[PDB]
Design an enzyme around this catalytic site. Structure first.
Site, PDB file in Angstrom:
ATOM      1  N   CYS A  53      12.703  18.299   3.728  1.00 48.21           N
ATOM      2  CA  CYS A  53      12.202  18.731   5.062  1.00 48.21           C
ATOM      3  C   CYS A  53      12.993  18.027   6.167  1.00 48.21           C
ATOM      4  O   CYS A  53      13.605  18.705   6.991  1.00 48.21           O
ATOM      5  CB  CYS A  53      10.696  18.521   5.216  1.00 48.21           C
ATOM      6  SG  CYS A  53       9.792  18.414   3.649  1.00 48.21           S
TER       7      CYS A  53
ATOM      8  N   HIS B  47      12.561  25.921   4.587  1.00 47.35           N
ATOM      9  CA  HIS B  47      11.825  25.536   5.814  1.00 47.35           C
ATOM     10  C   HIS B  47      12.061  26.600   6.882  1.00 47.35           C
ATOM     11  O   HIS B  47      13.232  26.848   7.218  1.00 47.35           O
ATOM     12  CB  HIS B  47      12.202  24.109   6.217  1.00 47.35           C
ATOM     13  CG  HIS B  47      11.582  23.102   5.310  1.00 47.35           C
ATOM     14  ND1 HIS B  47      12.267  22.539   4.254  1.00 47.35           N
ATOM     15  CD2 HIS B  47      10.328  22.603   5.262  1.00 47.35           C
ATOM     16  CE1 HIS B  47      11.467  21.713   3.612  1.00 47.35           C
ATOM     17  NE2 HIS B  47      10.273  21.730   4.214  1.00 47.35           N
TER      18      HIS B  47
ATOM     19  N   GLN C 120      13.985  21.409  -6.339  1.00 44.41           N
ATOM     20  CA  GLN C 120      12.958  22.189  -5.603  1.00 44.41           C
ATOM     21  C   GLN C 120      13.600  23.472  -5.064  1.00 44.41           C
ATOM     22  O   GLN C 120      14.640  23.367  -4.392  1.00 44.41           O
ATOM     23  CB  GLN C 120      12.378  21.319  -4.486  1.00 44.41           C
ATOM     24  CG  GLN C 120      10.867  21.407  -4.355  1.00 44.41           C
ATOM     25  CD  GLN C 120      10.325  20.333  -3.443  1.00 44.41           C
ATOM     26  OE1 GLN C 120      10.982  19.909  -2.494  1.00 44.41           O
ATOM     27  NE2 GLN C 120       9.112  19.882  -3.722  1.00 44.41           N
TER      28      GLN C 120
ATOM     29  N   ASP D  47      13.241  24.999  -2.488  1.00 42.56           N
ATOM     30  CA  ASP D  47      12.604  24.674  -1.188  1.00 42.56           C
ATOM     31  C   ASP D  47      13.209  25.547  -0.092  1.00 42.56           C
ATOM     32  O   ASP D  47      14.346  26.027  -0.259  1.00 42.56           O
ATOM     33  CB  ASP D  47      12.786  23.198  -0.829  1.00 42.56           C
ATOM     34  CG  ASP D  47      11.756  22.650   0.146  1.00 42.56           C
ATOM     35  OD1 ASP D  47      10.837  23.403   0.533  1.00 42.56           O
ATOM     36  OD2 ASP D  47      11.881  21.465   0.509  1.00 42.56           O
TER      37      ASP D  47
ATOM     38  N   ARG E  46      11.228  11.049  -6.902  1.00 44.32           N
ATOM     39  CA  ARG E  46      10.090  10.164  -6.542  1.00 44.32           C
ATOM     40  C   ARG E  46       9.782   9.252  -7.734  1.00 44.32           C
ATOM     41  O   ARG E  46       9.888   9.720  -8.886  1.00 44.32           O
ATOM     42  CB  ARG E  46       8.874  10.977  -6.087  1.00 44.32           C
ATOM     43  CG  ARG E  46       8.400  12.038  -7.068  1.00 44.32           C
ATOM     44  CD  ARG E  46       7.112  12.685  -6.588  1.00 44.32           C
ATOM     45  NE  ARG E  46       7.319  13.573  -5.448  1.00 44.32           N
ATOM     46  CZ  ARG E  46       6.380  14.346  -4.901  1.00 44.32           C
ATOM     47  NH1 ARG E  46       5.149  14.349  -5.384  1.00 44.32           N
ATOM     48  NH2 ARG E  46       6.682  15.117  -3.869  1.00 44.32           N
TER      49      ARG E  46
ATOM     50  N   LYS F  66      -2.440  24.114   4.350  1.00 39.66           N
ATOM     51  CA  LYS F  66      -1.561  24.549   3.229  1.00 39.66           C
ATOM     52  C   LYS F  66      -2.244  25.651   2.408  1.00 39.66           C
ATOM     53  O   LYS F  66      -3.489  25.643   2.327  1.00 39.66           O
ATOM     54  CB  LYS F  66      -1.220  23.354   2.333  1.00 39.66           C
TER      55      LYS F  66
ATOM     56  N   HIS G 261       6.761  24.952   5.510  1.00 40.80           N
ATOM     57  CA  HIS G 261       7.264  24.420   4.219  1.00 40.80           C
ATOM     58  C   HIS G 261       6.859  25.392   3.114  1.00 40.80           C
ATOM     59  O   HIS G 261       5.636  25.583   2.937  1.00 40.80           O
ATOM     60  CB  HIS G 261       6.665  23.045   3.894  1.00 40.80           C
ATOM     61  CG  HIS G 261       6.898  21.989   4.922  1.00 40.80           C
ATOM     62  ND1 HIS G 261       6.964  20.649   4.584  1.00 40.80           N
ATOM     63  CD2 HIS G 261       7.058  22.055   6.264  1.00 40.80           C
ATOM     64  CE1 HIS G 261       7.168  19.930   5.670  1.00 40.80           C
ATOM     65  NE2 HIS G 261       7.231  20.771   6.719  1.00 40.80           N
TER      66      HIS G 261
END
Ligand SMILES: C[C@@H](O)[C@H](N)C(=O)N(CCCCCn1cnc2cc(Br)c(Cl)cc2c1=O)Cc1cccc(-c2ccc3c(c2)CNC3=O)c1
Ligand SMILES: C[C@@H](O)[C@H](N)C(=O)N(CCCCCn1cnc2cc(Br)c(Cl)cc2c1=O)Cc1cccc(-c2ccc3c(c2)CNC3=O)c1
Ligand SMILES: [Zn+2]
Ligand SMILES: [Zn+2]
Lengths: 401, 400
Positions: B94, B145, B141, B143, B123, B224, B270
């Site tokens: 992000c 945005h 991910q 991912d 992580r 979310k 997200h």
């Protein structure tokens, strides 16, 4: 011809001091990168390489066994978790060996050619960083070949052919070659070094390549060939390397079952042709001065109308080019055609397919090149076929007449 | 059984070892599956008009402190040092997306901005809580945005919802449970949240998606939508997430010039659909029990001979299949046809093409599926055309 300027101009990438020597790849820059990956990937298939992916970090205990730790500990990024230290890999070799050591290996499985687009990290001094040329976070067109002593010559031979083959695509035909020989402090017998240096020498002779020696400049674990290419400005860039290793396999307990059933240690060949994908994109940028060959161009064709009257002809034509697999954008803005051409020429779009009333009525299109050439009005399908041929063949030059 | 760990080893897809806990070594056949999954997502990224970027592996701890994530997640973050500066190996993409957005004067007409990335994330999860590809330290991910206006939210959440069911349908996941998370502690006004929690709520109602509210488990930075898909064993997997962020854009100096020439902090959506690429590959491996759809299969076709008489016909058919964009190997080994066919059936090769004298003479080829269905001798060109369609359409089903 500066990659840091053209990089900002064509919105390819940027860099920040919150992440020194680690590139932020924007859409158009990441498109060039990925098209380079696709090219190398096609050569991996052609030259019969496996492609793997290794983890970003591994136990320091494993990196200690390589024998690189003491010499380059200062250059390696470390991170801790639950009383264990992990190194962020600056090299893909040890990971490739871990993959090799899964399952029993046989002489039949050699030569084993293991390629990777290996995301590597080096703690390089911040002062010595420069754009895409000198970075901390880099991607190697890396590979490791596991083979017998008998197979070294054939495999180095193939690496040499692969180097010149790939360099020719980008218009690099002036290559300087340097064979680095046994250093004062080395592992292995003098006989092993005689054979190894000979294997590299004969391989270059078998490809009719004149080279020269860098005396005692070889690594402690074996001799290397280094390939230096010359751009259109006749500037020297060391990119290609083929490095023999008689150490790392043994250190990381790599073995195979021979034809006599005796457990033997494989020879490892380290090879990178482009070297750093980031640096090579850097080099190509300055080489072509932003005029990337059509197959590499972030946007290959902009279909544009003169007036609103051709808006639906443009949309149909843009859809056809889309379906043909060409990276195409439509410019249907309320601007003069000269403005549209000027803007997309500045952004180095190879082809601008101009659609006026006469083009629509004939079912044709007027092709203008970013150099400013006019190829006249051509049949829509004949043009698409020609652009597909120029992309498929990864041609350096644009359409003629 | 259908353990992804067992199938992973059997078909030489991946391995993990103690020297790198929760980190995947992707072998050749496994990396092929991974890349085909990336190609699939990229096809959806083009369709739903997403640009694709790549961010730095690590960024300064100063930036991660400005985000407010260091506070409660530093213990699950990987950190390294260089020249007396602390850097965080990113657990998220992000912040890095905002930096790319911040570089260049963004206007209201550049919105909505759909920025996608295959984000290599890390992580520091407890080693005891790791299992296979399902819970890892090093993951990738799918991912993206979305930088949009306050009004553009509802439409951009519809696209996201549509994209989730679209992508899940490809692998044959139709049973989806959805949850809207609304907390005692929160940023901004209650009027803002009344519109933000409603933007998500109306979007799910419009799409006729039944959802259960999770009052409290949202975020201080915005609500979310979590998507949980069910496998053939009725096992739940929370893969998809759509998170609204009103804080992070402002906290990282994100701004666009509006229609009224007022500098407005853009809203950030997200979204991850597959979630972890490795976990999805894990779910898919178990779902299909190693019988991957042709388009995912490491090796899609094996062409083989009955005697050395057809060897050249095989090598030619192999080349025609390879030219047609099919992952194909040739089996000219001196082994009985029943031995050959078992080996490639064990390796879960969708199609086994056998070339006898009768096949050579007629320009035909005998086609057997890994399920053991004998489709008989068919015209070479009609087969390659049928295989091409099966792969290009990403069909779950084989030729019947
Ligand atoms: C070809 C490939 O398989 C091979 N493994 C490799 O990566 N090599 C081969 C030579 C190693 C010499 C000894 N050497 C050199 N530097 C090291 C640095 C560190 Br840190 C550690 Cl731990 C070990 C070493 C080390 O053994 C290095 C290699 C090859 C090609 C390009 C690059 C390379 C290209 C661009 C950049 C960098 C490296 C770093 N920053 C950049 O901008 C590096
Ligand atoms: C959709 C995407 O754009 C989003 N940004 C994201 O990455 N999210 C969602 C937002 C929740 C924030 C809470 N949260 C949770 N954990 C954290 C851990 C750390 Br470390 C830090 Cl700094 C922050 C956080 C944090 O904000 C996390 C997310 C989303 C989907 C799958 C996964 C995920 C999937 C599989 C695995 C893991 C994570 C870790 N190990 C695995 O095997 C994680
Ligand atoms: Zn290496
Ligand atoms: Zn996010």
């Amino acid at each position: 011809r500066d990659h840091r300027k053209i990089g900002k101009q064509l919105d390819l990438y940027h860099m920040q001091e919150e992440a020194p020597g680690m590139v932020f790849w924007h859409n158009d820059g990441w498109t060039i990168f990925r098209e380079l990956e696709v090219f190398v990937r096609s050569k991996l298939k052609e030259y019969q390489y496996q492609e793997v992916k290794g983890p970003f970090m591994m136990d320091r205990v494993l990196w200690e066994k390589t024998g690189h730790w003491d010499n380059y500990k200062d250059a390696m990024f470390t991170t801790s978790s639950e009383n264990r230290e992990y190194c962020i890999k600056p090299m893909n070799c040890p990971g490739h060996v871990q993959i090799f050591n899964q399952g029993l290996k046989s002489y039949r499985d050699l030569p084993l050619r293991m390629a990777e687009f290996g995301s590597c990290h080096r703690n390089e001094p911040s002062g010595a960083l420069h754009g895409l040329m000198r970075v901390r976070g880099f991607t190697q067109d890396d590979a490791h070949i596991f083979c017998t002593e008998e197979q070294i010559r054939d495999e180095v031979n193939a690496c040499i052919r692969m180097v010149y083959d790939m360099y020719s695509t980008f218009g690099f035909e002036k290559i300087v070659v340097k064979l680095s020989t046994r250093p004062d402090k080395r592992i292995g017998s003098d006989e092993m070094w005689d054979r190894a240096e000979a294997d590299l020498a004969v391989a270059l002779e078998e490809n009719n390549i004149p080279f020269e020696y860098q005396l005692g400049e070889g690594a402690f674990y074996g001799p290397k060939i280094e390939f230096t290419l010359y751009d259109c400005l006749d500037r020297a860039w060391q990119c290609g390397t083929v490095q023999l290793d008689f150490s790392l396999p043994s250190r990381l307990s790599a073995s195979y079952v021979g034809e006599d059933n005796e457990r033997k240690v494989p020879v490892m060949i380290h090879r990178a042709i482009l070297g750093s994908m980031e640096r090579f994109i850097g080099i190509l940028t300055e080489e072509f001065a932003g005029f990337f060959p059509t197959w590499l161009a972030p946007v290959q064709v902009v279909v544009m109308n003169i007036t609103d009257s051709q808006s639906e002809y443009v949309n149909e034509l843009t859809q056809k080019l889309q379906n043909a697999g060409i990276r195409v954008k439509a410019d249907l803005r309320n601007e003069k055609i000269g403005f549209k051409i000027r803007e997309h020429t500045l952004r180095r779009v190879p082809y601008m397919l101009v659609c006026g009333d006469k083009e629509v009525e004939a079912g044709k299109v007027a092709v203008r090149t970013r150099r400013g050439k006019d190829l006249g009005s051509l049949d829509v399908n004949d043009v698409i076929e020609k652009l597909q041929q120029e992309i498929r063949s990864r041609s350096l030059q644009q359409l003629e007449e």
